[PDB]
A paper describes a structure:
Deeply knotted proteins, whose topologies may introduce substantial barriers to folding, thus represent an interesting test case for protein design. Here we report our attempts to design proteins with trefoil and pentafoil knotted topologies. We extended previously described algorithms for tandem repeat protein design in order to construct deeply knotted backbones and matching designed repeat sequences (N = 3 repeats for the trefoil and N = 5 for the pentafoil). We developed an approach for designing tandem repeat proteins that fold into a class of knotted topologies known as torus knots.
Numbering used by the authors: -6 to 2, 4 to 27, 32 to 275
The structure:
């Protein structure tokens, strides 16, 4: 009845998440800074205080991350749906229902439960990651003048090679959300690495090796403090998700011309609905 609590790990997905979240967090702290190290330690202290607060009421770090993700992914899905509705000239509800229809068709083909009978976070993740990945696929296909199928098959090939170069199973035998995250995170990382390489005037390899080194150093420090790789990922996701949420709220408020508190109120109604769930 016990599982990964026995020390048997998704190691590929964990490394990829460390790399991607580290990239995204570095960009966010650089934009927020004052000093970046000051912002980093400030965010660390705020997250630690919030963790103590949720411990004082009996909420674990994993559950805190789960609720924060419900907030963040709700915001990201809302922004993506709104942008697609505007680009297509239809309402947000139409885009939402088309996304649900498409994802449920794919799950049918796979002989799996649909989004309606899945857990709240898993359903939100499936919807959001499907839309993000499809947007990235169509963008890269347009940019390279190739087929969307070509893009998706090259991405699946690259991720499958990476997986099999680590004694792990292929992309064909992973569960739905894990494969979806593997694909999405790989694509997002490649795009971020390439754009930063162009912006800073250095090679892609420079960026990627700096990233790998930053992550290995953080992991060695955590191991020195007696912190597990899973806990390291959870702390990094807490920091990053808080920063992403705050940026999304600020930007949506500035774009709609409303106060930040109105953005939060709308999000909080919608989210407390799924939180009672």
């Amino acid at each position: 009845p016990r599982g990964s609590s026995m020390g048997i790990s998704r190691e590929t997905l964990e490394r990829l998440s460390l790399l991607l979240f580290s990239m995204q967090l570095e960009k966010l702290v650089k934009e927020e800074a004052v000093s970046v190290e000051t912002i980093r330690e400030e965010l660390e202290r705020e997250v630690d205080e919030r963790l103590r607060e949720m411990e004082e009421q009996g909420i674990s770090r994993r559950e805190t991350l789960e609720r924060l993700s419900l907030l963040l992914f709700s915001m990201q899905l809302e922004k993506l749906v709104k942008e697609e509705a505007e680009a297509r000239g239809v309402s947000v509800e139409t885009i939402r229902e088309e996304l649900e229809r498409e994802v449920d068709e794919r799950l049918r083909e796979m002989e799996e439960q649909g989004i309606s009978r899945r857990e709240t976070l898993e359903r939100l993740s499936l919807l959001l990651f499907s839309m993000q990945l499809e947007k990235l696929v169509k963008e890269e296909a347009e940019a390279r003048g190739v087929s969307v199928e070509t893009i998706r098959e090259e991405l699946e090939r690259e991720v499958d090679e990476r997986l099999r170069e680590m004694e792990e199973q292929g992309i064909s035998r992973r569960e739905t959300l894990e494969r979806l995250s593997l694909l999405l995170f790989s694509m997002q990382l490649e795009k971020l690495v390439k754009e930063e390489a162009e912006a800073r005037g250095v090679s892609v390899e420079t960026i990627r090796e700096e990233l790998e080194r930053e992550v290995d150093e953080r992991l060695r420090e955590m191991e020195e403090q007696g912190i597990s790789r899973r806990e390291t990922l959870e702390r990094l996701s807490l920091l990053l998700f808080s920063m992403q949420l705050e940026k999304l709220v600020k930007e949506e408020a500035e774009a709609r011309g409303v106060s930040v508190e109105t953005i939060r109120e709308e999000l909080e109604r919608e989210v407390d609905e799924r939180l009672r769930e």
